[PDB]
Amino acid sequence: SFQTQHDPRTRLGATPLPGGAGTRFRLWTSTARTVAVRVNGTEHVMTSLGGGIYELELPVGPGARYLFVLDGVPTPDPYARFLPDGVHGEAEVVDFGTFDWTDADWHGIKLADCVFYEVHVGTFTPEGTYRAAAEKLPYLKELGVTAIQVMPLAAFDGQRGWGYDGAAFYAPYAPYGRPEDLMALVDAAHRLGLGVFLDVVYNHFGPSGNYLSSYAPSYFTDRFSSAWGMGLDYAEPHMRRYVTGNARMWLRDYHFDGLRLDATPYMTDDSETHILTELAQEIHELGGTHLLLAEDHRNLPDLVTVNHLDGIWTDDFHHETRVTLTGEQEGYYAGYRGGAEALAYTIRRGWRYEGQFWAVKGEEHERGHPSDALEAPNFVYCIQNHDQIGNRPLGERLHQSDGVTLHEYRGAAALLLTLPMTPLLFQGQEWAASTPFQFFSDHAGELGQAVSEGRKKEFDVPDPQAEQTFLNSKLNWAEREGGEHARTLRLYRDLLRLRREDPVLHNRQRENLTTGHDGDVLWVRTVTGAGERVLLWNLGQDTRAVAEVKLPFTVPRRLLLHTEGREDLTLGAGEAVLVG
Ligand SMILES: OC[C@H]1O[C@H](O[C@H]2O[C@H](CO)[C@@H](O)[C@H](O)[C@H]2O)[C@H](O)[C@@H](O)[C@@H]1O
Ligand SMILES: OC[C@H]1O[C@H](O[C@H]2O[C@H](CO)[C@@H](O)[C@H](O)[C@H]2O)[C@H](O)[C@@H](O)[C@@H]1O
Ligand SMILES: OC[C@H]1O[C@@H](O)[C@H](O)[C@@H](O)[C@@H]1O
Ligand SMILES: OC[C@H]1O[C@H](O)[C@H](O)[C@@H](O)[C@@H]1O
Ligand SMILES: [Mg+2]
């Protein structure tokens, strides 16, 4: 009996009318005294309906250009479905009914079947567009990933950016392509049997192009702040519906299979029904199989068990892994010892911090909650993602950090890709890409200068505002064809094939998973009715024979995969083997 709060009849923004009657324009404003729509250059006074609601229908169709005029001030539509001249410009009317979908036989993807591949549209290809990205879909399918995780697409200011400065949440960022180019990308992925997930940012708006306060200051609150401005007020139903409307758009209208909610700890809401709960209600009302993941550092199972999200990006695994390989201790890396015993524990528990004191200076508190309620697929694990690369001063990848070998990098892949937790890969990870993923932006004027200065002071650091920083982060596809890149790629292919094919690795129950260590050798054991598998990873500096590893069970004898392609059951420094 949950009823969506959304009715296409009353949708804010510009919506094509039935029977070729044109377009219905609607907005909410709490403060304007005069209200008009300017369509293709001509102003028309809008009708006041009460509650600050304004409406007008005109015989203009899809492609018409418009913005609103509030007390005589031309103001972009926060509900714009496309912004071909960027975030300060006219919106375009978009008709979602016109695209010829061919994906009727696609029915989404379960979390337990996801192997995520995180894509940044602007750097994934030379062109940095959906159309170029679509041409790489067969490669991704053959690689063995099953779900593309697309970094945010909401329009932001400038000609490149990560996407976290999104300001017009309903409008796909024009430099990447037109709405129909995005649809073409999703449709193509579905035809290849790949899921497509979108990163969405419901905890803040970017600093340039967010005009919501021009309509109603009450979308926001001074009670708390975001990175960029006033906090998003989830006590205000129009603010609630701005994001639930947006979620429903991406899933229903663009055929996304799921959403990754950025920084959920900062979606502050003291309402009886939390916004996260209402988001899950709203997306499920669509009557599909769409998923919701949270990027949440609190180690809080209630995200799944109470808000009814599907899973959580849980960095404890990532952090324990990186500290194991580098020994680094800056910032949140100080929360982890690393090493075989530490990794065994973190995997055993899903996340490490279940309520114990987090001693990181400046952040001290009792962090996390018991993980018992959560099942293996509920944890999303990785050894690389946009933040864990880009939030480093030089944006270097794991194999490029000081004191990491390619052997260790390959061992880390075997651990990640054989665990029953839901894995994510960052673009180019699979071939040990030579290119960094640096923080880049392209804000205007004083704001751009402030970003450059901010980055410099925070940590030569590449200037986020420089074109070179963006270009240096572009994938070099040709390099995967050779040398160690090709070697790494072969291993990734073999691992993803084993994950797909191996009847014991199909396990998705923490009940069947055990871990432990002998010195610097980590072991991870899976036992089901289909058989037994053991992953051994030598995290030491010396050579270890599998036969000499002390285990509380008899080690299986058949060598299924060795990260360095060795014939014998022996582990060089940093190497791993799967036995069965
Ligand atoms: O404060 C948030 C929640 O804390 C508890 O929930 C966590 O801890 C429980 C045991 O301490 C677990 O059973 C549960 O799965 C965790 O989410 C508390 O039980 C919840 O009511 C609180 O909302
Ligand atoms: O060598 C001095 C450091 O030894 C430990 O850190 C190393 O050993 C860990 C396993 O116990 C690894 O995860 C880490 O990468 C190594 O640097 C100790 O934990 C550190 O505090 C010492 O500085
Ligand atoms: O992973 C734990 C870390 O998550 C980060 O995203 C938080 O901003 C930081 O405060 C915390 O140290
Ligand atoms: O501004 C007048 C009213 O507008 C809308 O109803 C908002 O949902 C409400 O919270 C506000 O009180
Ligand atoms: Mg020993």
For the chain, give every domain's residue range: 7-102, 103-440+473-508, 441-472, 509-580
Q: What span, in angstroms and rounded, lies between the C-alpha atoms of 385 and 402?
A: 18
> What's the CATH class of domain 103-440+473-508?
alpha beta
Give strand pairing partners of 525: 514, 534
Q: Are the C-beta atoms of residues 237 and 177 closer than 8 Å to each other?
A: no
Q: What span, in angstroms and rounded, lies between the C-alpha atoms of 25 and 496?
A: 48
Q: Are the C-beta atoms of residues 284 and 307 closer than 8 Å to each other?
A: no
Q: What span, in angstroms and rounded, lies between the C-alpha atoms of 141 and 133?
A: 13
* Catalytic-residue membership of 453: no
| Cα 519 to middle of ligand 2, angstroms | 13
Q: Determine the Cα angle at 218 with ends 213 and 221, to 5°.
A: 95
Long-range contacts from 203-206, C-beta under 8 angstroms, 24+ separation:
203/232, 203/262, 203/263, 203/264, 203/266, 203/267, 204/228, 204/229, 204/231, 204/232, 204/263, 204/266, 205/166, 205/167, 205/169, 205/229, 205/232, 206/156, 206/157, 206/164, 206/165, 206/166, 206/167
Q: Which of 270, 299, 351, 369 to mutate to test the pocket of ligand 1 (most atoms within 8 A of CB)?
A: 369
Q: Are the C-beta atoms of residues 47 and 55 closer than 8 Å to each other?
A: yes
Largest Cα span, the chain: 83
Supply 365's token pair. Answer: 């508190």
| Cα 54 to middle of ligand 4, angstroms | 14
Give the burial class of 297: count Cβ atoms within 10 A of its Cβ; 0-12 exposed, 13-18 middle, 19 or more buried: buried
Supply 301's token pair. Answer: 């199972």
Q: What span, in angstroms and rounded, lies between the C-alpha atoms of 343 and 421?
A: 14
| Cα 424 to middle of ligand 2, angstroms | 27
Q: What span, in angstroms and rounded, lies between the C-alpha atoms of 78 and 170?
A: 8
- What is the secondary structure of 499-556 as a DSSP string? HHH-TTTT---GGGEEEEEETTEEEEEEEETTEEEEEEEE-SSS-EEGGGS--SSPPP
Q: Which of 204, 295, 297 to mutate to test the pocket of ligand 3 (most atoms within 8 A of CB)?
A: 297
CA neighbours closer than 13 Å in the CB half-sphere of residue 337: 11
Helix, strand and coil content of the chain, in percent to the nearest 5, comes to 30, 25, 45
| H or E, element range at 198 | strand 195-200
Q: In the PDB record, what is the listed experimental method?
A: X-ray
Other CB atoms within a 10 A radius of the CB of residue 482 amount to 11
Give the burial class of 523: count Cβ atoms within 10 A of its Cβ; 0-12 exposed, 13-18 middle, 19 or more buried: buried
165: Cβ contacts below 8 Å, ≥ 6 apart: 156, 157, 158, 206, 207, 208, 228, 441, 443
Give strand pairing partners of 39: 42, 66
Residue 288, ligand 4, Cβ within 6 A? no
Length, in residues, of the chain: 580
Other CB atoms within a 10 A radius of the CB of residue 467 amount to 12
Give strand pairing partners of 576: 537
Q: What span, in angstroms and rounded, lies between the C-alpha atoms of 298 and 176?
A: 33
Q: Determine the Cα angle at 465 with ends 460 and 466, to 5°.
A: 70
- What is the secondary structure of 444-485 as a DSSP string? -HHHHHHHHHHHHHH--PPPTTSHHHHHHTS--GGGGGSHHH
Ligand 4 atom with the smallest distance to the CA of 216 is: 1
Residues with CB under 6 A from ligand 1: 300-302, 305, 369-370, 373
Q: Determine the Cα angle at 432 with ends 429 and 434, to 5°.
A: 110
Q: Are the C-beta atoms of residues 508 and 520 closer than 8 Å to each other?
A: no
Q: Determine the Cα angle at 187 with ends 427 and 93, to 5°.
A: 105
Q: Are the C-beta atoms of residues 534 and 555 closer than 8 Å to each other?
A: yes
Residue 151 DSSP class: P
Ligand nearest to the CA of 53: 4
388 annotated to bind ligand = yes
What's the CATH architecture for 509-580?
Answer: Sandwich (2.60)
Q: What span, in angstroms and rounded, lies between the C-alpha atoms of 290 and 295?
A: 17
Q: What span, in angstroms and rounded, lies between the C-alpha atoms of 82 and 258?
A: 21
Nearest partner of 415 among 346, 359, 368, judged by Cα = 346
Q: What span, in angstroms and rounded, lies between the C-alpha atoms of 388 and 318?
A: 8
Q: Which of 337, 346, 352 to mutate to test the pocket of ligand 2 (most atoms within 8 A of CB)?
A: 337
Positive or negative torsion for Cα 64, 68, 74, 77 = negative
Ligand nearest to the CA of 302: 1
Q: At what angle do helices 406-418 and 316-326 cross, to 10 degrees?
A: 160
Supply 185's token pair. Answer: 């990308």
Supply 449's token pair. Answer: 């200068």
Nearest partner of 260 among 82, 408, 385, judged by Cα = 385
β-strands 195-200, 258-261 pairing: parallel
What Rg do the C-alpha atoms of the chain give, in angstroms?
A: 25
* Catalytic-residue membership of 233: no
Whole-number Cα distances in Å, 428 to 132, 476, 538: 16, 9, 25
Topology classification of domain 7-102:
Immunoglobulin-like (2.60.40)
Q: What span, in angstroms and rounded, lies between the C-alpha atoms of 227 and 195?
A: 31
Q: Are the C-beta atoms of residues 165 and 151 closer than 8 Å to each other?
A: no
Scanning the structure block, which residue is given the tokens 């209208």? Answer: 253
Q: What span, in angstroms and rounded, lies between the C-alpha atoms of 12 and 386?
A: 33
Positive or negative torsion for Cα 464, 469, 474, 476 = negative
Strands of 206-342, DSSP E: 220-225, 230-232, 258-261, 291-295, 311-313
| Cα 324 to middle of ligand 2, angstroms | 8
| Cα 323 to middle of ligand 5, angstroms | 21
Three-state SS sequence of 70-111:
ECCEEECCCCCCCCCCCCCCCEECCCCCCCCCCCCCCCCCCH
| H or E, element range at 211 | none
Strands of 374-444, DSSP E: 379-382, 422-426
Residue 324, ligand 2, Cβ within 6 A? yes
Q: Are the C-beta atoms of residues 353 and 301 closer than 8 Å to each other?
A: no
CA neighbours closer than 13 Å in the CB half-sphere of residue 566: 18
315 annotated to bind ligand = yes
Backbone angles phi, psi at 201, to 5 degrees: -120, 90
Supply 253's token pair. Answer: 């209208």
Three-state DSSP at 359 gives: coil
Whole-number Cα distances in Å, 12 to 32, 54, 76, 553: 16, 9, 13, 63
56 annotated to bind ligand = no
Residue 21 DSSP class: -
Q: Given the residues 92, 187, 199, 295, select the one marked as catalytic.
A: 295
Nearest partner of 414 among 486, 342, 495, judged by Cα = 495
Nearest partner of 548 among 565, 571, 525, judged by Cα = 571
| H or E, element range at 161 | none
Positive or negative torsion for Cα 167, 173, 174, 180 = negative
The domain 441-472 having CATH identifier 1.10.10.760: the answer here is yes
Q: What span, in angstroms and rounded, lies between the C-alpha atoms of 323 and 383?
A: 11
Fold equal for 7-102 and 509-580: yes
Q: Are the C-beta atoms of residues 345 and 359 closer than 8 Å to each other?
A: no
Scanning the structure block, which residue is given the tokens 């001063």? Answer: 393
319 annotated to bind ligand = yes
| H or E, element range at 290 | none
